[PDB]
Structure formats: structure tokens, C-alpha cells
């Protein structure tokens, strides 16, 4: 990272970043199977197994009601629209049965819908296996007062994933803001990331930033089919990496003239990214975040431009407003402020209270000289990388 404080205007330019873009999505559907538990019923008085069995039986009904309400006639709306479209495609019975038949003998099937998508499907059957094998044999003539506290603990430890999934899906009207550890486990996420069509470099980058991968995704509930739960979860795709890119952070350049303020604020602030073919521009601050030396922007909210970055449209997007404004431009390796406006501005330190009280005039700084900047008892934090 090389931050260049531009020497002839109050709007700096930077360079040296390597960019990664969100170029698509990878669908992934699951067939979490509860197992047949509606038959089992205990009437011996309150006990330990009874509470868990009732909890599971109520969670199933709650998920059924949530799915019934679901069918209505951090990320942009493109993600949710694509997810809704894929869910509508999956919902139909013919391909629901096709997926169920595909996931009958093995636990890995790269199937395909009526349209063209990668809907690699994985099934989990721990709860169903437990209920079918051990619980039915252990229960005998409807006797829930069995001294196997180990078995009760095993039931509590086994039904946890299904209970958590039901609660998470019910608490957010069928769509979850992000992918919890219960929705996809570590090994399953690693396999799903490694199986999608991207190069080895991007695969390694995602195997590193699993956290970002899991924060950018989401999941949608499909519906309840008999005695099973079917949901879908998407993983963001980073297709193009290692491109040079830059950010413009501009502030008004106001010069006091004994009452009259002559500011200069360009309107081209944002991240510019010259990939193969053109240069893209993301206006919103939420599109891009800084991950050390890299930057993560999503291509779904990009604008196209052709020739720029001369600081001089063609005479450059620049305004000449006469009304000044005070705030802090927290660049990754600095800060630029134009607080004149009869206000107080100063400099803070990580070990000394008050050093180098800030004068006005679109000031200058070399990162480490300060760690917090104050403007009339306001706290601003410098990202110390």
C-alpha cells in the first residue's frame, strides 16, 4: 500500500492494490433428513427423553408453518432476486423427486435442474440414522424412563443441528442474513468451495478468506417434504483477481477570503478498477472493503468509464461550491480534513494526550503521527495496519 497525498489539490490518489471481484454465485442444495419420529410417543409422565422428543416434533410443525407462510405470490437486491428465482425453480415436485432419488445411495451428486445451473447436492443423515437404529430399539413398550443418561445426552447432542436450523429459518421469515456454522459445516464448505469452477489461485484465496466467503453468502428455505427438510445455500464466486486498482477520496478545498469560502470538491470518489476490457466504478462505500493489501468489491453494482485519472466528463468531475463542510476522510493510510467553519480540530496520539493541535487548511499527515483525530469532541479512529 502506497498512499500518495496529492500535492496540488485536496483529493488524494492511491495505488498498489490488488482487486478481487464477485463474478457469480454457486448454488448448493441440502436434504437434511429428520427421520420418522411422528410414530414415537411417550406417556409415562415428564422425563428427559420426552422433552427432547416434544421439542423436535414441535420444531417440525413450526418449520412446516413457516414454509407455508413463505410462499408469497449487506448485499444488493440482485443476490436475493437470483436466490428467489433459483428457489422457485427448485420448488417443483418433479425435480424435488429427482434430487431425492439422486441422493439415495451416495452423499455427493452433481445434478442439474431444468435450466443450466450447478446444484451440487449433499445429504446429512446423522439424526435419521440415530432415530432409525438406536432410539427405536432402546424404547420398549413406550417406556421413556430409561436409565441410559448416555442415550439421553446423545439425543440432545444429535438433534442440535436440526433444532438450530429450524429456529434460524423461523426467526428471519425464511431467509437468513448469512451462513451460520450450522447451515454448512467446515468440511462441507471446503468441499463445496473446492468443487466449483475457478482457478487454483482463487481456490487458495477462498480457502484463506473462508470468513469473507461465509459472510457474503446466504440461505433460503425451500420447503418441507414429508419427513425431511430441504434448503438451499449459495456461495459467492471470486473469478478475477490480481488487478491493479485505486481509490479517490476527495474533500472540499476551501480557501478563506475573509467571509467568502471557495471550496473545491470533485464528485468522482470511489474505487476505480481496470479489469480486462474496461474500467469499473463503484459509488457506494458498502460495495468495497479493505482486506489488508487487497480490496473486495462486487461487480453487480459497477459503472463503466473509459479514460480518467489525470486530475485535470473530461475537465474532470469537479465542483466549485461556496458552502464548506467539515468531516474526516479516513483513507486507509491517512486522513484529510477541511474543517474551517469556526470549529476546533486537533491531533491525538496513542501514548500522549494532546500533541500538534491541528490548524485549518486541508492539512497533511504521514499515518503514524496520529491514531485519532478530534473535531469538536468527536472520536474518529484510524485503521492501524
Amino acid at each position: 500500500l502506497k498512499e500518495s497525498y496529492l500535492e496540488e489539490s485536496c483529493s488524494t490518489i492511491t495505488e498498489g492494490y490488488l482487486s478481487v471481484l464477485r463474478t457469480g454465485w454457486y448454488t448448493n442444495v441440502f436434504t437434511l433428513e429428520v427421520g420418522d419420529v411422528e410414530n414415537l410417543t411417550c406417556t409415562d409422565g415428564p422425563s428427559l427423553i420426552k422433552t427432547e422428543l416434544d421439542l423436535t416434533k414441535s420444531a417440525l410443525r413450526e418449520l412446516k408453518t413457516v414454509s407455508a407462510d413463505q410462499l408469497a405470490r449487506v448485499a444488493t437486491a440482485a443476490a436475493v432476486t437470483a436466490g428467489i428465482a433459483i428457489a422457485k425453480t427448485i420448488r417443483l415436485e418433479s425435480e424435488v423427486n429427482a434430487i431425492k432419488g439422486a441422493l439415495k445411495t451416495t452423499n455427493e451428486a452433481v445434478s442439474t435442474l431444468g435450466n443450466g445451473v450447478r446444484v451440487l447436492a449433499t445429504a446429512v443423515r446423522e439424526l435419521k440414522e440415530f432415530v432409525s437404529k438406536n432410539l427405536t430399539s432402546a424404547i420398549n413398550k413406550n417406556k421413556c424412563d430409561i436409565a441410559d443418561l448416555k442415550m439421553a445426552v446423545s439425543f440432545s447432542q444429535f438433534n442440535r443441528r436440526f433444532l438450530n436450523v429450524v429456529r434460524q429459518f423461523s426467526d428471519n421469515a425464511g431467509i437468513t442474513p448469512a451462513i451460520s456454522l450450522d447451515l454448512m459445516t467446515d468440511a462441507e464448505l471446503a468441499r463445496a468451495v473446492s468443487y466449483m469452477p475457478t482457478s487454483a489461485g482463487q481456490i487458495k484465496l477462498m480457502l484463506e478468506n473462508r470468513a469473507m466467503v461465509r459472510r457474503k453468502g446466504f440461505g433460503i428455505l425451500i420447503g418441507v417434504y414429508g419427513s425431511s427438510v430441504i434448503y438451499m445455500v449459495q456461495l459467492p464466486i471470486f473469478g478475477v483477481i490480481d488487478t491493479p486498482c485505486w481509490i479517490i477520496k476527495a474533500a472540499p478545498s476551501c480557501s478563506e477570503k475573509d467571509g467568502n469560502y471557495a471550496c473545491l470538491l470533485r464528485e468522482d470518489q470511489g474505487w476505480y478498477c481496470k479489469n480486462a476490457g474496461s474500467t469499473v466504478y463503484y459509488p457506494n462505500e458498502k460495495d468495497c472493503e479493505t482486506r489488508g493489501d487487497h480490496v473486495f468489491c462486487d461487480t453487480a453494482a459497477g459503472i463503466n468509464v473509459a479514460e480518467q485519472s489525470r486530475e485535470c466528463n473530461y475537465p474532470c468531475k469537479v465542483s466549485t461550491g461556496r458552502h464548506p463542510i467539515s468531516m474526516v476522510a479516513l483513507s486507509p493510510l491517512g486522513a484529510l480534513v477541511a474543517c474551517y467553519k469556526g470549529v476546533s480540530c486537533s491531533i491525538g496520539s496513542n501514548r500522549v494526550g494532546i500533541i500538534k493541535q491541528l490548524p485549518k487548511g486541508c492539512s497533511y499527515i504521514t499515518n503514524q503521527d496520529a491514531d485519532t483525530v478530534t473535531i469538536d469532541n468527536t472520536v474518529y479512529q484510524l485503521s492501524k495496519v
Epitope: 451460520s180 470468513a211 461465509r214
Partner: antibody
Framework: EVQLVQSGAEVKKPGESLRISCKGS????????ISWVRQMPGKGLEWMGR????????NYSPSFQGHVTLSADKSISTAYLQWSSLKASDTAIYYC?????????????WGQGTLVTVSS | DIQMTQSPSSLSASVGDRVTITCRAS??????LNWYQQKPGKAPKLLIY???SLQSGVPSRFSGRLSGTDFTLTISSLQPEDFATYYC?????????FGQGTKVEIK
């Protein structure tokens, strides 16, 4: 199994600097984010600092800013915390705590806890 | 800062009795919320994350509920092994804060 242990600095005179370390073991350092926390006796926990996974945000609480220099060290999987100016009110127990994956940011696998006192 | 107010400060209940603890947030934090349990002289252990889930290695009587900007922990059945202090913490973004704490005593 992630195991977190503490370091030893019991008594530190007023007007001096204190430093302790939390030697993480078992897991790897640069995969998920790490943080500190403290508790003076007879009160509730309050948050002090954190290091987001690779953002290196190294953010601190707004009140106790300009006083702490939380820093990581990838060399031997160790994190240190250094204090600028100790007062007669910062006596507490200092916990080192990890963070986790997923979206809810739940702190798990805490540390054993070390008591630090200020006195003449 | 996202202040938190916890209520009631301290309470006592018999064994096999439902206990409720309510945490209130100054501003909306959606569903990012965690609970904690700290026995005296020990490190806290995680109980509930995302205000509704259940972290591994925890008995199934610890259930939480969300209602807008109000959260609640409800112990299904108090047990003699449940004397501690319960906190609530938000994780909306940088930074994070805790609560004042609620003390639970048994009879």
C-alpha cells in the same frame, strides 16, 4: 482443541507500563480473529480491544483510546498487550479470548485469567 | 456506543421454576446477540449465539427469544448446578459491549 494461556506480571507501580501475553496453541493464528477483555472486581465485563481476522483493524474502545497498543505477532503464534500509563483504578483480571467463524461473532475458548494489581 | 440495560439485577427462584432475564438495547442490532454464563472465579462459557441458536455442549433447557430490539433468556427448569451470573453482548460491528449482569440464586 484450542488452548489459551496467560503470562505473568502481577504488581506494577503507578505511572509505569504493564505487558502480558496470551500464547495461543493448537490452532493456527491467521484464520479467525482474536480479542482481549477485562473485568475489575465487583462489576461486569467490559470490552477493551480486538484484531479482526486479516483487516488488522486493531480497534479499541473509544474511552480507553490513546492508552493501549494491542498488537499481534505471527512469528511464534503470540499476542501481546502493552499499557501506556497505569493508574490506581485499572486493577482487574485480564482475559484473553478467541473469536469464531460464521456471522454471529461468538467468543469461545476463553483463557484461564490473570490478576493484575496496582500498588506502591 | 450501543448501551445495554439488564433487568432484573438479581433474583432468586426454587428448583424446577421458570426464570426469565431480559436484555434491552439502545438501538436496533437486528439478530446479532450472544449470552454468557460465568461461575464465580472461572472463565465464562458461551451459551446462546444469534439470540436463538444453541452452542455445542450445552443442556437443552437454555432457549432464547428475539423480539425486535428486545431479547430474553428463559431457563426451562432451574437446577442446583446453575448458580452463576449471565451477561448479554452485541456484535453488530466494531466495537462490542457487554451488560451489567444478572445474578441468579437458588433456594
Amino acid at each position: 482443541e484450542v488452548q489459551l494461556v496467560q503470562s505473568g506480571a502481577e504488581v506494577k507501580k503507578p505511572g509505569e507500563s504493564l505487558r502480558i501475553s496470551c500464547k495461543g496453541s493448537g490452532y493456527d493464528f491467521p484464520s479467525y480473529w482474536i480479542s482481549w477483555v477485562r473485568q475489575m472486581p465487583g462489576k461486569g465485563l467490559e470490552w477493551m480491544g480486538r484484531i479482526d481476522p486479516t483487516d488488522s483493524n486493531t480497534n479499541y474502545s473509544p474511552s480507553f483510546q490513546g492508552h493501549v497498543t494491542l498488537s499481534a505477532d505471527k512469528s511464534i503464534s503470540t499476542a501481546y498487550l502493552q499499557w501506556s500509563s497505569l493508574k490506581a483504578s485499572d486493577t482487574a483480571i485480564y482475559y484473553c479470548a478467541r473469536h469464531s467463524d460464521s456471522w454471529s461473532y461468538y467468543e469461545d475458548s476463553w483463557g484461564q485469567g490473570t490478576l493484575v494489581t496496582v500498588s506502591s | 456506543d450501543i448501551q445495554m440495560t439488564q433487568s432484573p439485577s438479581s433474583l432468586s427462584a426454587s428448583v424446577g421454576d421458570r426464570v426469565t432475564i431480559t436484555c434491552r438495547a439502545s438501538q436496533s442490532i437486528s439478530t446479532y446477540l450472544n449470552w454468557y454464563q460465568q461461575k464465580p472465579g472461572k472463565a465464562p462459557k458461551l451459551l446462546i449465539y444469534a439470540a436463538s441458536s444453541l452452542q455445542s455442549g450445552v443442556p437443552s433447557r437454555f432457549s432464547g427469544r428475539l423480539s425486535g430490539t428486545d431479547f430474553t433468556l428463559t431457563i426451562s427448569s432451574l437446577q442446583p448446578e446453575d448458580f452463576a451470573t449471565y451477561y448479554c453482548q452485541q456484535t453488530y460491528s466494531s466495537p462490542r459491549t457487554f451488560g451489567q449482569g444478572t445474578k441468579v440464586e437458588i433456594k
